[PDB]
Write a protein that binds this ligand. Structure first.
Ligand code: HEM
Length: 153
């Protein structure tokens, strides 16, 4: 469970993300693909992208990044009270896209990397720790929902 102070640190940096959702989304997905190429090879929609420049130029990838961060932001704003938001996400990701928890760890890493790269003055040790807890809670709760659906991700 996160303290109220921890949630406030999470939402403080998230407001910075929201100043340019598309840009952050692109950077996060590109970082994910670079750091864990196996993730991209799983996304049929995007696996044709060969270079970083191609990734940045893709309107489709940019739109997707906004979809991803919008869903995550909606979850974070509930400060743990996120069952109604998390359930549909677990449903598609367990049964349609088949995304193991390890891949959610990878994207969590990319999120933290990009937030630190862009907002170091608002993303120091304590804020990083809080965001890490928030993403940990997200992954824990989604794993439980995965199992309820019969997926051992
Ligand atoms: C922060 C974690 C994530 C969030 C919030 C998120 C969110 C979303 C949302 C909102 C959608 C569109 C609706 C849906 O199908 O559920 C989506 C689609 C999808 N996600 Fe995720 N996702 C996350 C992580 C991942 C990871 C790590 C992968 C792959 C390694 C992945 C693979 C996919 C795929 C393949 C689609 C379908 C894309 C398409 O063809 O349109 N997701 N995701």
């Amino acid at each position: 469970v996160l303290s109220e102070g921890e949630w406030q640190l999470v939402l403080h940096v998230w407001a910075k993300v929201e100043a340019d959702v598309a840009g952050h989304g692109q950077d996060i997905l590109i970082r994910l693909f670079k750091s864990h190429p196996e993730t991209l090879e799983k996304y049929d929609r995007f696996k044709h992208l060969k270079t970083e420049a191609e990734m940045k130029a893709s309107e489709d990838l940019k739109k997707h990044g906004v979809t991803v961060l919008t869903a995550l932001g909606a979850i974070l704003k509930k400060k743990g009270h996120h069952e109604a938001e998390l359930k549909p996400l677990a449903q598609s990701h367990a049964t349609k896209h088949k995304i193991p928890i390890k891949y959610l760890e990878f994207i969590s890493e990319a999120i933290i990397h990009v937030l630190h790269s862009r907002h170091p003055g608002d993303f120091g040790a304590d804020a990083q720790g809080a965001m890490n807890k928030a993403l940990e809670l997200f992954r824990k709760d989604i794993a439980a929902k995965y199992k309820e659906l019969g997926y051992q991700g």
